[PDB]
């Protein structure tokens, strides 16, 4: 039946779906075919499927996290010590429901937790996240005065895309160079983030250049922030400043081989430390200081 097929199914639309929410739904669908009463024929098989999915990955991180979340939910489900049927039914139900809840969470984020850009505080944003854009659009809707700042994305020309998505609203924006990042910290207020995953240590699993940005923020004491749909805590620990589970090579040292070729392999995933989160926008209420760690503890009961 495949989760991979389901994943393939959604491509051009989305924007509304939220990472694991779709993956979780797919998993649920996979489950509700091959008898969800038994535990020996089921949990192990699910795990195997997840492993297969992991193996099959080109460049995607949060899937694992989603799977883990699903597993946790499943574990939580069977503790009532009554009957196998009701619990099974509940399990079957909880996928579409979960998806629905995601939308609610997004709505909450967009109406309640949007009081960080209000007094024309110029926002420094890089890394395309859907939640960020939702926040932007709903700020425009509320008329809550604002200005936008985006550093040019040029590994695969997502910058242009971002610019286009900003033209829909109809508000002036500017191009920024990521080497001349030290040149402009003057009028732009704070640095906000759209990323790929939330770390076990505390920092953020993000794209091409972030550590430098973080450093600059620290120098300027203009607080660093992360804007996300809050269920992307990937089971990964960045123990050092340059060591992680990565989709590609870590700063690939290439040999002088051909003419104008082996250089375009830019390190398109990078990390910054735990002592940077002044606030993180979470759908379970605005909670940050050591929240991710707490969540992890709650999950692994340690």
């Amino acid at each position: 039946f495949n989760i991979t097929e389901t994943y393939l199914r959604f491509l051009e639309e989305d924007t509304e779906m939220t990472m694991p929410i779709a993956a979780i739904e797919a998993l649920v669908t996979l489950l509700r075919i091959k008898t969800p009463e038994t535990a020996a024929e089921m949990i192990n098989t699910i795990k195997s499927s997840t492993e297969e999915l992991i193996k099959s990955i080109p460049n995607s991180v949060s899937l694992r996290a989603g799977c883990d979340i699903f597993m946790r939910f499943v574990l939580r489900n069977l503790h009532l010590y009554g009957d196998w049927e009701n619990c099974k039914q509940h399990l079957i139900e909880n996928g579409q429901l979960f998806v629905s809840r995601a939308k609610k969470s997004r709505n909450k984020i967009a109406e309640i937790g949007v009081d960080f850009i209000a007094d024309d505080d110029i926002i420094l944003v890089h890394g395309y996240s859907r939640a960020v854009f939702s926040l932007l659009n709903h700020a425009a809707n509320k008329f809550i005065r604002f200005r936008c700042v985006v550093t040019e994305s040029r590994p695969s020309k997502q910058g242009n895309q971002l610019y286009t998505l900003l033209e829909q609203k109809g508000i002036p924006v500017t191009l920024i160079v990521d080497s001349a990042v030290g040149a402009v910290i003057d009028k732009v207020d704070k640095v906000f983030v759209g990323a790929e995953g939330v770390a076990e240590s505390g920092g953020i699993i993000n794209l091409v250049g972030t550590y430098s940005v973080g450093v600059l923020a620290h120098n300027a004491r203009k607080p660093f922030y992360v804007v996300t749909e809050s269920h992307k805590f990937v089971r990964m620990f960045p123990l050092s400043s340059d060591d992680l589970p990565m989709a590609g090579p870590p700063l690939d040292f290439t040999r002088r081989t051909d003419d104008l070729e082996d250089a375009l392999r830019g390190p398109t995933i990078d990390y910054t430390a735990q002592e940077y989160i002044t606030a993180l926008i979470t759908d379970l209420g605005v909670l940050t200081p050591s929240a991710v760690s707490e969540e992890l503890i709650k999950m692994w009961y340690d």
Partner: peptide, 15 residues
């Protein structure tokens, strides 16, 4: 110090 290794594998000293 960044990493700390206890019974729950890995986590920050924010515990």
């Amino acid at each position: 110090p960044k990493g700390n290794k206890i019974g729950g594998k890995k986590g920050s000293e924010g515990e």
